[PDB]
Design a binder for this molecule. Structure first.
Ligand SMILES: CC(=O)N[C@H]1[C@H](OC[C@@H]2COCCO2)O[C@H](CO)[C@@H](N)[C@@H]1O
Length: 513
């Protein structure tokens, strides 16, 4: 794939990947790189920092306010009033000013921009946050939080109850609760009225409240989350907590009857002797079609059609891809087509794993389902590859140093046989150190580095009233917190389909040390 043929393909993540590959091997000339901003589906991350080593284009400042960026903290009083206010959007700039210039600018702006006045006068004190808090300036609170996480202070009921009306609130609460920072912020958020929050914010405040053993407020927070959540999975997560705290049996029933298949609905079914949910069985009789399941470009194309589709087209696509060769795609289409009400747990390219013990098959299949939905040429935003979504570094270490495959290329990860083989190899590594398939899942996504760090702490995956479920809410990376829960559900299911059932309650017992 020369830069030439790549330019003739539609903008996609596949195209990005391949451009990235030329870049990392230094095969893109400064010539080649000229018209290349335009050819890049997602100009973020390494492809951006890599292309900016060739062409450092680091504009851009708006033609109108160009004058404004010629002033510094020394000459800002020589700037017109528009320029003054523009530069005062940066708390760093404000911090850089001297105090008497802050006093002057503060008077200048008291009328029309008291937001600026409050921050200016705040930075004339030994504690800006404290000044902002006393004024109950909500916009300013968040600007200070984004400027420095290190400010921590008790907040009264009046003030905390106004914080959730700002966009910044959700991430602010998620961050400090999950990171266990800003103790005084956290303590103060116990007095947020549940009426004033919803959805994820309410859920996180439920978790907060548990950590201080305030189970009543936790319940009310979790209840409000249950009633407002958009996704059934999340709603189930919250009903679980409602139940675990108060043990109202109408809550567990509701959860056991959920259309969403997740660890909480699974657990609830097991606690109530409810039968395992229905799993669809896909066996297309037809053998193959044209489609090249090894062409990454074709996946990106067909993936776009599938997402920008309606009744008419979906049904043509479902029938087109109703073959054994294209089964992953068939399921992908069906999953969308029936609006996620049906549960699909295919086992494609089964030959490549049928000889492993059933417990290991389930783990592999569980990872692949979450990683890729078994799409062989799947590529992530970080350029992880194939069904098992290997990062290129790791794929090359295994392929070249460890397993010594002849003529190994990282694009070998697009082969089922290889994906499953390297996955098995890497899962052997992880399971041998971690034991629990939950822990393994955490480490497959976020690395064993952070997994071991988290397990070493004495407030994670130890014993306690609400364990291990609380620890699962406090996994410090969001992507990994979610990943673990989803893969664990898939694991239960696949062990079931493989005739190697386990009670999920036993998984939960062995999460405590
Ligand atoms: C193709 C893709 O982007 N997969 C990502 C996957 O996204 C979910 C996929 C998207 O494609 C359809 C199936 O689920 O999330 C994982 C983290 O949970 C990532 N490590 C995977 O790389």
């Amino acid at each position: 794939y020369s830069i030439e043929k790549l330019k003739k393909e539609e903008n996609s993540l596949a195209k990005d990947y391949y451009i990235y590959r030329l870049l990392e091997k230094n095969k893109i000339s400064k010539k080649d790189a000229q018209d290349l901003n335009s050819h890049i589906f997602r100009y973020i991350g390494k492809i951006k920092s890599e292309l900016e080593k060739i062409i450092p284009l680091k504009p851009y400042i708006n033609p109108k306010y160009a004058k404004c960026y010629t002033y510094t903290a020394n000459t800002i009083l020589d700037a017109n009033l528009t320029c003054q206010s523009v530069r005062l959007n940066s708390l760093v700039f404000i911090a850089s000013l001297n105090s008497k210039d802050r006093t002057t600018l503060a008077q200048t702006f008291k009328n029309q921009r008291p937001d600026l006045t409050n921050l200016l006068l705040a930075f004339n004190t030994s504690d800006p946050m404290s000044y902002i808090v006393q004024k109950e300036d909500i916009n300013g609170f968040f600007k200070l939080y984004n400027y420095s996480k290190k400010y921590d202070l008790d907040l009264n009921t009046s003030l905390v109850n106004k914080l959730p009306n700002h966009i910044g609130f959700k991430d602010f609460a998620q961050n400090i609760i999950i990171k266990k920072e800003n103790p005084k912020f956290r303590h103060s958020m116990l007095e947020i009225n549940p009426e004033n929050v919803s959805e994820d914010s309410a859920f996180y405040l439920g978790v907060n409240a548990l950590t201080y053993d305030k189970t009543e407020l936790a319940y009310d927070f979790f209840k409000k989350a249950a009633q407002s959540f958009k996704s059934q999975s999340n709603k189930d997560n919250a009903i679980f907590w409602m139940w675990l705290i108060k043990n109202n049996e109408e809550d567990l029933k509701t959860l056991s009857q959920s259309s969403s298949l997740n660890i909480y609905s699974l657990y609830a079914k097991e606690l109530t002797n409810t039968p395992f949910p229905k799993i669809e069985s896909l066996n297309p009789s037809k053998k193959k079609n044209n489609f090249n399941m090894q062409d990454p470009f074709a996946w990106q194309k067909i993936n776009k059609q599938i997402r920008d589709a309606n009744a008419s087209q979906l049904d043509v696509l479902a029938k087109e891809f109703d073959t054994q060769e294209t089964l992953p795609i068939y399921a992908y289409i069906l999953e969308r087509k029936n609006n996620f009400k049906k549960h699909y747990f295919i086992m494609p390219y089964y030959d490549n794993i049928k000889d492993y013990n059933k417990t290991r098959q389930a783990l592999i299949l569980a990872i692949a389902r979450q990683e890729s939905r078994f799409i062989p040429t799947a590529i992530s935003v970080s350029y992880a590859l194939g069904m098992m979504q290997f990062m290129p570094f790791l794929a090359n270490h295994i392929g070249e140093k460890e397993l010594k495959i002849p003529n190994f290329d990282q694009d070998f990860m697009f082969k089922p046989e290889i994906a499953y083989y390297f996955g098995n190899y890497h899962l052997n590594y992880l399971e041998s150190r971690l034991k629990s398939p939950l822990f393994v899942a955490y480490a497959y996504n976020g690395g064993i580095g952070f997994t071991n760090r988290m397990l070493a702490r004495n407030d994670m995956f130890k014993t306690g009233k609400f364990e291990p479920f609380l620890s699962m809410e406090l996994v410090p990376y969001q992507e990994s917190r979610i990943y673990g829960k989803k893969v664990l559900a898939n694991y239960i299911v696949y062990r079931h389909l493989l005739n190697d059932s386990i009670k999920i309650s036993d998984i939960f017992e062995n999460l405590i040390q």
